[PDB]
């Protein structure tokens, strides 16, 4: 089986990446390396069942080449800054609505049989169910990257069904670990080395979410990938996220621990409600049964993936 | 009030735009007539209170100029022919979820308070309940019209969120009555014009549906934008549809019957299981009690609606 990561070349499509390759797939990569790096993936470069395409996915020519030859696609390319959709939403649409569709314009007239899609919690906006089910509804996103988001989902079942492939959408929590350049917990960390004394935490700091490390994450995806793969749903839904959640003040506490600092905190207070910033979910934390019903349960929960995401990126 | 109404020389769009001009509203229509006609919408040419705007969405120069000093907008334009999906996904892509983020874009730079948009009852797939009610999920379109509807909701929602003005969705079933150039019973007096001993029938004939005549349609949406204006919510979702639904062969034998004819019956069997073509829902019917709740009910149920379009339907083909 070939499968072709987009974004292999990012953070959780480099650590899949490591994953496929082990499992012994084919494993083809596109990625513009506009946020991703080879250092990400430079252990695969010159495999035999390794293919490195360096490539936007706005380019169309290049997603036709992309799936030439291809049993299975992981989109996982995109641009997952939500704090840019209220200056630059123009952005989040090209880099997850966008490219999506050119994705599945190519996977059309394919042979490929399988798209797996990492969508992400916030389809469910300020959800009012926690733990947020699959099924919860009306899907309300409050940001340009949530919509994005939806959007991407939306078109990946309607091609699914019309044109005759099955498709994976799993909606991430928030996903942490090593090799990641976007998120509260390397933003902290470089806030720190640049100033030791005083630390700036965007919003109210009670901002509350789920987090899952990336060792889980990869060990997620691929067990749910292996039971879908075994069933016959066309379009299947899971949430994959931790069974706990923690606030952004505990996150700054544990970040400072680790780096043996002791600053200030100094809270913005935020937006809309002590929001990080326009769009910014304030609560979040997916309902993981469904997942759970495969075998797959985190082994760290969010404190801990913290503390051994900070751990990692120090190094 | 200035309202810009998109897709508003179309078919939905004009029976609105007249309700609009009627109680006085100021309307400006951006129509590319690609598949409206200035003929729906002359009687209100030269208007001090009508402006129209011939443009393609596509365009987003076209588009920030039409959302210029307009406090709502009615985004109805679109391409709505399911049955191309399979062929022209493109097409559906452009017209659904392209030319919505344009308006979106431009609304965003603009004093727009409210954006009204007719979705799709397809955004349900093949629901599981029914009637379908607006919370129902996972929302799994089996069309790539369904699809583009369901994407072009979640940008208005992301985009009303983040930019502070507020959005009416209304998930509309299958809309019926004079000026429609789409769907099943155009299809039916057309193909029997052209031979009334045979009408070819897509699918099983047990696809089925429900049908709301375009007068309760408009009083709906209407109903339900003053309760909106009226509400406190930042982005609402309403199911749009009739008490009841009625299979395609009934569909066949009204349009017979009101055409004076009884031809043979062919069916083609369909794909997937009798639909009439890759991502025809085979069963929809929407639950409306949430519309309900602003005192709006149709006037018509699903048969009633349909020999109505048939005949409507006729006397305009005389004419
Ligand atoms: N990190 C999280 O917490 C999280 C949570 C939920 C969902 N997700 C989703 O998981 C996926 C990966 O996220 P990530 O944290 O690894 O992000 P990342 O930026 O580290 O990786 C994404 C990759 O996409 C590539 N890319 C971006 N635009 C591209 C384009 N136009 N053409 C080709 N390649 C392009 C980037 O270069 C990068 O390698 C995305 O779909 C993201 O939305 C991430
Ligand atoms: N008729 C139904 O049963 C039904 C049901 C549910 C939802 N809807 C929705 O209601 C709206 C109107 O449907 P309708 O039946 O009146 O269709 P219609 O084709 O009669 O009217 C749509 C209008 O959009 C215009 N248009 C298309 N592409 C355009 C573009 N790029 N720029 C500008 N204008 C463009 C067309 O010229 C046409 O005038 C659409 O959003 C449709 O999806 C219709
Ligand atoms: C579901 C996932 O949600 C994830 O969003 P998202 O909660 O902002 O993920 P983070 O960017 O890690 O932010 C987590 C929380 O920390 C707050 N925060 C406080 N200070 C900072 C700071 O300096 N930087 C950052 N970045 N956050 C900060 C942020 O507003 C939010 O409440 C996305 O990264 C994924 O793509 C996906 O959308
Ligand atoms: C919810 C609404 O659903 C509506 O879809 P949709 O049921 O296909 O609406 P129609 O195009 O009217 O088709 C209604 C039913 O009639 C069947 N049918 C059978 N024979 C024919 C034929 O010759 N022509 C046509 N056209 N249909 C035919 C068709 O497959 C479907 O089962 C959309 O038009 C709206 O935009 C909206 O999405």
Not at 100 to 106: C, E, F, H, M, R
């Amino acid at each position: 089986m070939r499968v072709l990561v987009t974004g292999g070349a990012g953070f959780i499509g480099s650590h899949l990446v490591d994953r496929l390759m082990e499992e012994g797939y084919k494993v083809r990569v596109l990625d513009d390396l506009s946020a991703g790096s080879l250092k990400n993936i430079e252990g695969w470069l010159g495999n035999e069942n390794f293919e490195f395409i360096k490539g936007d996915m706005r380019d169309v020519e290049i997603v036709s080449k992309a799936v030439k030859d291809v049993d299975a696609v992981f989109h996982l390319a995109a641009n997952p800054e939500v704090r840019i959709g209220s200056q630059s939403p123009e952005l989040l649409y090209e880099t997850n609505v966008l490219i999506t569709y050119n994705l599945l314009n190519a996977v059309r007239n394919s042979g490929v049989k399988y798209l797996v899609f990492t969508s992400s919690s916030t389809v469910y906006g300020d959800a009012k169910v926690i733990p947020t089910p699959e099924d919860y509804a009306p899907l309300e996103p409050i940001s340009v990257y949530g919509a994005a988001k939806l959007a991407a989902e939306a078109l990946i079942s309607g091609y699914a069904h019309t044109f005759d492939f099955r498709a994976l959408i799993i909606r991430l929590a928030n996903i942490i670990g090593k090799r990641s350049n976007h998120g509260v917990i390397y933003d902290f960390i470089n806030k720190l080395k640049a100033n030791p004394n005083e630390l700036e935490i965007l919003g109210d700091g009670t901002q509350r979410k789920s987090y899952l490390h990336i060792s889980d994450t990869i060990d997620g995806i691929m067990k749910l990938f292996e039971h879908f793969l075994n069933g016959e749903e066309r379009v299947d839904f899971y949430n994959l996220g931790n069974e706990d959640w923690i606030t952004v003040k505990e996150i700054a506490e544990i970040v400072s621990e680790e780096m043996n600092l002791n600053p200030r905190f100094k809270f913005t207070g935020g937006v809309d409600g002590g929001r990080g910033w326009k769009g910014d979910v304030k609560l979040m934390l997916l309902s993981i049964e469904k997942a759970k019903r495969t075998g797959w349960k985190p082994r760290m929960n969010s404190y801990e993936a913290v503390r051994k995401t900070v751990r990692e990126m120090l190094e």
